[PDB]
Design a binder for this molecule. Structure first.
Ligand SMILES: CCCCCCCCCCC(=O)OC[C@H](COP(=O)(O)OC[C@H](O)COP(=O)(O)OC[C@@H](COC(=O)CC)OC(=O)CCC)OC(=O)CCCCCCCC
Ligand SMILES: CCCCCCCCCCCCCCCCCC(=O)OC[C@H](COP(=O)(O)OCCN)OC(=O)CCCCCCCCCCCCC
Ligand code: HEM
Ligand code: HEM
Ligand code: HEM
Ligand SMILES: COc1c(O)c(C)c(C/C=C(/C)CC/C=C(\C)CC/C=C(\C)CC/C=C(\C)CC/C=C(\C)CCC=C(C)C)c(O)c1OC
Ligand SMILES: CCCCCCCCCCCCCCCCCC(=O)O[C@H](COC(=O)CCCCCC)COP(=O)(O)OCCN
Ligand SMILES: CCCCCCCCCCCCCCCCCC(=O)O[C@H](COC(=O)CCCCCC)COP(=O)(O)OCCN
Lengths: 93, 54, 75, 99, 385, 50
């Protein structure tokens, strides 16, 4: 077939990024490393840092929507009781 | 030292040991679960009731 | 010789401190319904008072005390 | 179904092969229904003719009447056949019919 | 060259699951799309093995599903794995889509990939509805009644498309026989949308949680992301097995074990749990015609999101205000499901009218306004004048 | 709705088949069929059991 429209990604040898000069990388084999020394000092010390950074953006919305749900229940509980029969008659019509 | 050149090196060693070892795992694994299940619920089963009213 | 087990527990917990109060709140309320439609205006009135809620309050408590105990007495 | 209603004052008794799975509560509801008939309804409720009070039934008025009284069967193995005992067995038998 | 690169058929497998270049920093949220491919394989296989014992006639349908549960060897495993498998299929899709909302995967150059996804979501709601009716329980009969009668409000063609869907004058035997035949078909249309979906991903690749280019650091798929996908596959099967073998009727309704009876109505007619947010948007509008338009608009409003995001940064990683309002939208979607499982009663009518405004206002008023604010907040915090 | 229209909540008894490792008590099933044949079967069917 023919070539198609060009993209923002290529393949191995020509990936389309900028040219690199002056960066050096080092590594070691897995067979030469001690087994999984990365589970602990990571499930307590690091996992707590990750929790403390982001828990405020979830729990303030959750607190708003859960408080709104309970006040709706308790009011519906009350309207269909014997004490809340007179208020049920008004807010319907 | 020799625990690789005959036990792991090949993988006609290790497809054959895996597939062959999977069959004896099932028959041994099933007998052990079925014995623990029936002993944990002994007295409730039918064979225990049938043995109490002959 | 052996009477039913659930009435023995239902009667025992009606002497509970919580069980003594929930009885009389249902009774005093039964005496109120004796009159309110006995008066004229029998079936043309808009509504009239039952005592279903006071009966549910006693029954619900009596059921949370006898449920975890009963099946140890049955065979 | 025409003959079933003719013998029960218009109400139809359902099939019980799936009653444990087709009700909210399961085995706890079937048992409490049978042991839950009071001997006099609460003050105020006016029952239609041919119905009985059971507070576990939605509405509080059910066409079935009480059918379990003490020592109406004699068991082979010799267990005392009280009201609570017979109820525990039918609800265990009927769950096996569903599962 | 290697044989896997020169052969016509293996070259496609190599280019997609072996040598495909991937960003090194993608996290476990990028594993949900492989699970959705396993879900579709589970459903198509289990359903074909049940279809050998099923009967679609309205007098035989309910009793044929019980014949599968009692008489067929390993038949209760087939069904419960099928009924609970669909609830797991929808839960992984809500997480897949919410991921794209967060990291900006809908933006250019991946707009066409996001639009083919919205088509898959429509075809999967349709498939699940048609199969719930093949049971012909009490919820199966009255759910098809109230949904097919919504197309009666379309002006001048409403009463003719309903009699054409039903094949008569009510939900009846032509209705159940045609719902089963369409239900086998549509899963194979979904499988072709998935092929088109992957083709649109191969030309630009995946994004990453930082929202910048990934062409500077790439690793291949084989033995890094094949074995990272294997971690979540065995967790999926473990949690599914716990539901199929220990709690197989917790995510369903009891009234569907009663056979369908058109003379007796149930006290509460509700769908499955995953159509409840959309069932509550319908009841919020007090006019019949406008409620049907609004229910469908709630699915097609996802298509205007590439145009209302006015940010020069991709994703919500470095955005304070867009993080807070992403989670307002999530918990508003859960409250819509709760409202849809309640009675039409005070105050559950006003609660569902305010919460359906917050659903449409997020896409159209909130995103373009705070995205403009965040652009200008980055500028003045750095530039000295 | 009103509590009388929804019905009373059935309590939680301790059934011997509750739990992930427990079976039915098969002496109660046999004992329970006797209660079906002599009380219930006058007015109830069991059409799906062979
Ligand atoms: C009902 C049907 C569901 C069945 C499918 C279940 C799969 C759901 C997965 C949802 C998800 O994608 O959340 C991903 C998020 C992790 O984000 P991350 O890449 O930064 O963490 C990498 C980790 O640190 C390295 O962990 P590592 O690579 O070393 O090992 C992974 C292993 C856990 O290892 C441990 O012993 C503890 C470290 O297994 C797994 O973690 C399995 C994956 C859950 O998970 C989190 O831990 C935090 C987010 C909580 C999500 C809750 C909301 C969803 C409802
Ligand atoms: C059509 C509309 C579809 C909408 C469907 C909505 C329901 C979908 C439920 C899933 C919502 C969450 C999926 C989207 C989140 C993906 C991104 C993410 O991970 O969340 C951001 C947060 C922190 O991630 P970071 O900022 O650190 O990113 C860099 C990571 N290396 O990571 C987190 O902290 C995740 C915390 C999630 C907690 C909220 C759980 C939501 C489930 C509520 C269930 C309520 C009971 C049913
Ligand atoms: C131990 C014996 C019995 C058991 C366990 C039993 C079980 C049940 C159950 C579970 C229901 C349905 C309740 C509901 O839907 O909430 C029912 C309904 C009914 N049963 Fe029974 N049954 C028994 C015996 C009888 C007998 C002897 C009769 C004789 C007339 C009878 C007549 C009815 C009727 C008329 C209904 C319909 C209730 C209504 O529509 O209001 N039952 N039964
Ligand atoms: C995307 C794929 C599929 C989805 C999401 C899906 C969904 C469903 C659902 C939700 C039900 C009702 C479950 C219940 O409560 O019993 C159902 C029933 C059924 N489906 Fe599927 N289905 C899919 C594929 C298939 C296929 C390909 C077949 C092939 C015949 C099939 C055959 C059946 C049958 C026979 C039933 C009725 C038996 C039963 O109730 O389990 N399904 N389907
Ligand atoms: C049967 C249903 C689906 C299947 C099998 C599927 C499959 C996949 C796969 C394998 C990926 C690449 C890996 C990944 O990003 O997790 C992907 C990415 C993506 N999917 Fe889906 N998908 C499905 C449904 C959807 C839906 C419903 C949407 C949106 C409405 C969607 C939108 C996207 C987007 C935007 C991406 C790219 C994310 C990124 O690169 O950051 N897909 N899909
Ligand atoms: C981002 O990196 C990725 C990536 O991580 C992944 C996983 C994939 C691959 C992802 C997928 C989701 C795979 C696609 C899966 C499908 C399209 C599912 C298709 C499923 C079918 C067509 C079902 C086939 C089932 C049968 C034929 C049933 C057989 C039944 C029999 C034999 C029973 C016999 C009896 C009767 C009555 C017929 C990528 O393409 C990719 O991009 C590079
Ligand atoms: C959208 C539909 C899916 C399209 C296909 C994509 C998914 C790939 C399918 C799965 C891959 C398996 C392909 C087998 C690889 C070997 C092919 C091969 O050896 O090519 C052929 C022989 O293949 C055959 O005999 C028929 C193939 C049967 C296909 C089985 C269904 C060898 O031909 P070769 O490339 O060596 O050159 C000619 C030398 N005489
Ligand atoms: C009969 C069973 C069906 C199986 C075959 C599937 C074909 C269904 C077509 C689905 C259309 C998908 C459109 C969603 C994306 C829209 C956004 C976009 O810009 O993409 C569209 C993609 O459109 C198509 O996919 C149709 C091409 C035919 C496919 C032949 C393999 C841009 O391309 P296109 O030019 O085709 O659309 C604009 C028309 N001027």
């Amino acid at each position: 077939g023919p070539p198609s429209g060009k993209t923002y990604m290529g393949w191995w040898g020509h990936m389309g990024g900028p040219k690199q000069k002056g960066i050096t990388s080092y590594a070691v084999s897995p067979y030469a490393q001690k087994p999984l020394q990365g589970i602990f000092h990571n499930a307590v010390f690091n996992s707590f840092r990750r929790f403390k950074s982001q828990f405020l953006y979830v729990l303030i919305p959750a607190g708003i929507y859960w408080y709104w749900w309970k006040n709706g229940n308790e009011y519906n509980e009350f309207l269909y009781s014997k004490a809340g029969r007179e208020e049920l008659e008004r807010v319907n019509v | 030292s020799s625990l690789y050149k005959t036990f792991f090196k090949r993988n006609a060693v290790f497809v054959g040991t895996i597939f062959a070892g999977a069959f004896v795992f099932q028959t041994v694994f099933d007998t052990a679960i079925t014995s623990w299940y029936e002993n944990h619920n002994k007295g409730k089963l039918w064979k225990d009731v049938k043995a109490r009213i002959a | 010789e052996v009477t039913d087990q659930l009435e023995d527990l239902r009667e025992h917990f009606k002497n509970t401190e919580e069980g003594k109060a929930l009885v009389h709140h249902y009774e005093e309320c039964a005496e109120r319904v004796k009159i309110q439609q006995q008066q004229p205006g029998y079936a043309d009135l808009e509504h009239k008072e039952d005592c279903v809620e006071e009966f549910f309050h006693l029954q619900h408590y009596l059921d949370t005390a006898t449920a975890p105990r009963l099946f140890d007495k049955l065979k | 179904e025409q003959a079933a209603r003719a013998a029960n004052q218009g109400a139809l008794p359902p099939d019980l092969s799936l009653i444990v799975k087709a009700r909210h509560g399961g085995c706890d509801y079937i048992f409490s229904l049978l042991t839950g008939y009071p001997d006099e309804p609460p003050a105020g409720v006016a029952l239609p003719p041919g119905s009985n009070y059971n507070p576990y039934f939605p509405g509080g008025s059910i066409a079935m009447a009480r059918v379990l009284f003490d020592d109406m069967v004699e068991y082979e193995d010799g267990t005392p056949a009280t009201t609570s005992q017979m109820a525990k067995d039918v609800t265990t038998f009927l769950n096996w019919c569903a599962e | 060259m290697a044989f896997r690169k020169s052969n016509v058929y293996l070259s496609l497998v190599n280019s997609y699951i072996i040598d495909s270049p991937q960003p090194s920093s993608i996290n476990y949220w990028w594993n949900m799309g492989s699970l959705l491919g396993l879900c579709l394989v589970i459903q198509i296989v289990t359903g074909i093995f049940m279809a050998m014992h099923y009967s679609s006639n309205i007098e035989l349908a309910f009793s044929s599903v019980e014949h599968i549960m009692r008489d067929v060897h390993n038949g209760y495993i087939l069904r419960y794995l099928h009924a609970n498998g669909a609830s797991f299929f929808f839960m992984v899709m809500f997480m897949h889509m919410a991921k794209g909302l967060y990291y900006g995967s809908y933006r250019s150059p991946r707009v066409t990939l996001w639009n083919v996804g919205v088509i898959i979501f429509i075809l999967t709601i349709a498939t699940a509805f048609l199969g719930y009716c093949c049971v012909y329980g009490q919820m199966s009969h009255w759910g098809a009644t109230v949904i097919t009668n919504l197309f009666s409000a379309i002006p001048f063609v409403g009463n003719d498309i309903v009699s054409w869907l039903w094949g008569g004058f009510s939900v009846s035997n032509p209705t159940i026989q045609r719902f089963f035949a369409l239900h086998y078909l549509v899963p194979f249309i979904i499988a072709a949308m998935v092929i088109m979906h992957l083709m649109a991903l191969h030309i630009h690749g995946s994004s990453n949680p930082l929202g910048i280019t990934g062409n500077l650091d790439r690793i291949p798929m084989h033995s890094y992301f094949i074995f990272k996908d294997l971690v979540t596959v065995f967790l999926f099967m473990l949690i599914l097995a716990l539901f199929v073998f220990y709690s197989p009727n917790t995510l369903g309704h009891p009234d569907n074990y009663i056979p369908g009876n058109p003379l007796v109505t149930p006290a509460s007619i509700v769908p499955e749990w995953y159509l409840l947010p959309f069932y509550a948007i319908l009841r919020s509008i007090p006019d019949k015609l406008l409620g049907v338009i609004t229910m469908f608009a709630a699915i097609l409003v996802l298509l205007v999101l590439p145009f209302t995001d006015r940010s020069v940064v991709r994703g919500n990683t470095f955005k304070v205000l867009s993080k807070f309002f992403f989670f307002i939208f999530v918990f508003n979607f859960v409250l819509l499901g709760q409202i849809g499982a309640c009675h039409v009663e005070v105050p559950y009518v006003l609660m569902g009218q305010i919460a359906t405004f917050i659903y449409f206002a997020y896409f159209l008023i909130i995103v373009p306004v705070i995205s403009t604010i965040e652009n200008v907040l980055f500028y003045i915090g750095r530039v000295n004048k | 709705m009103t509590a009388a229209e929804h019905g009373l909540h059935a309590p939680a008894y301790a059934w011997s088949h509750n739990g992930p490792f427990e079976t039915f008590d098969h002496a109660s099933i046999r004992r329970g069929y006797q209660v079906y044949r002599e009380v219930c079967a006058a007015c109830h069917s069991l059409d799906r059991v062979a």
